[PDB]
Design a protein around this nucleic acid. Structure first.
Ligand code: SF4
Ligand SMILES: [Ca+2]
Length: 349
DNA sequence: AAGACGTGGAC
DNA sequence: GTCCAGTCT
């Protein structure tokens, strides 16, 4: 494996200095900000993350401010980003950093990795970029790039394949400046060596790329096809009382959409009667106004919205809470239920 | 191991 | 429609 590591390095790092996007989290190397951006970037595109990162850092300018904030306030800031246990884990990890480590982000891989939500990629991403620690930062971009560079045909969906890529990076990483190197590989996959129609002709490391020589760039990386996924009808109801207040409820911390608020729903494995019975509060449910789909990575919801009129015969017991329409802004809903409300509003016109 | 776990660009 | 931008269990 006569791979000219140093030669390869100098070129890649040169192209990076010329073409790097000026992104908000690249203004400096504050471990806190880098860490926040890398969590936001997990399975989430850069252009999507930019506005979230700006508001989040404005609301929580430092690690302590995030640790000090309330769970609701943090989760509201994550509303719409998806995979919401990321922020549950980041909040807890930061709380841990505050109480245990006195505010400083641990610079040791094994100590940093021990924190919730910090997987192999985030360790390398945060520690290299912000501390100089030469740990690999292998994401989907890197895997695709390396798979083509070294013509690796292993299924990237296998945890072992990733472990191999990490070993490859180690073999070729620029230990002088690992952060800059790690980001360069990622940026490469993001800008040049794209999932489709890679610009190999413009690529700075074309010379070293084994997939280019064989003309199989498009066919890599190898990855098992995503399968079809379970469908799940859902019955949702918007119960408004005479005064205009609407009833909502906070989902439990274990499972789908943990700790997010929603409109009282039940899986329609009978329709309305199930909603009616479930809440068994003196509530009456009416014709379903609209139906639609909302997808997940591992299932698909088919929703049905039933307006109802709430009559007060008792108190509001947890998890349920009663909220005026004006104060719904304060609660973090998932996108599925955000649409439920919008359709309800348009209907009531 | 492979399924859980959200959402929106870009074909 | 398909693909895809990580971590926990
Ligand atoms: S030459 Fe083509 S396949 Fe190889 S790294 Fe560059 S863009 Fe990717
Ligand atoms: Ca870890």
């Amino acid at each position: 494996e006569r791979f000219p590591a140093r030669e390869f390095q100098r070129d890649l790092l040169d192209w990076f200095a010329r073409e790097r996007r000026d992104l908000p989290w690249r203004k400096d190397r504050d471990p806190y900000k880098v860490w926040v951006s890398e969590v936001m970037l997990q399975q989430t595109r850069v252009e999507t993350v930019i506005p979230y990162f700006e508001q989040f850092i404005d609301r929580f300018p430092t690690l302590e401010a995030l640790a000090d904030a309330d769970e609701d306030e943090v989760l509201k800031a994550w509303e719409g980003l998806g995979y919401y246990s990321r922020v549950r884990n980041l909040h807890a990890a930061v709380k841990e950093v505050k109480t245990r480590y006195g505010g400083k982000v641990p610079d040791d891989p094994d100590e940093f990795s021990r924190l919730k939500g910090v997987g192999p990629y985030t360790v390398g991403a945060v520690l290299s970029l912000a501390y100089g620690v030469p740990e690999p930062a292998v994401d989907g971009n890197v895997m695709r790039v390396l798979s083509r560079l070294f013509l690796v045909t292993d299924d990237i969906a296998k945890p072992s394949t990733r472990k191999r890529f990490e070993q490859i990076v180690r073999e070729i990483m620029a230990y002088e400046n690992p952060g800059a190197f790690n980001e360069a590989l990622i940026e490469l996959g993001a800008l040049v060596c794209t999932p489709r129609r890679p610009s190999c002709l413009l690529c700075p490391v074309q010379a070293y790329c084994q997939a280019f020589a064989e003309g199989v760039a498009e066919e890599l990386p190898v990855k098992m096809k995503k399968t079809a996924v379970k469908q799940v009808p859902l019955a949702v109801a918007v119960l408004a009382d005479d005064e205009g207040r609407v009833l909502i409820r906070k989902r439990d911390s274990t499972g789908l959409l943990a700790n997010l608020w929603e409109f009282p729903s039940c899986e329609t494995d009978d329709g309305k009667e199930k909603l009616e019975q479930m809440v068994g509060l003196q509530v009456e449910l009416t014709e379903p106004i609209v139906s639609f789909e909302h997808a997940f990575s591992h299932l698909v919801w088919q929703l049905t919205v039933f307006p109802g009129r709430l009559v007060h015969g008792g108190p509001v017991e947890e998890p349920y809470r009663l909220a005026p329409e004006d104060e719904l802004k304060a609660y973090a809903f998932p996108v599925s239920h955000q649409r439920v409300w919008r359709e309800y509003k348009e209907w009531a016109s």
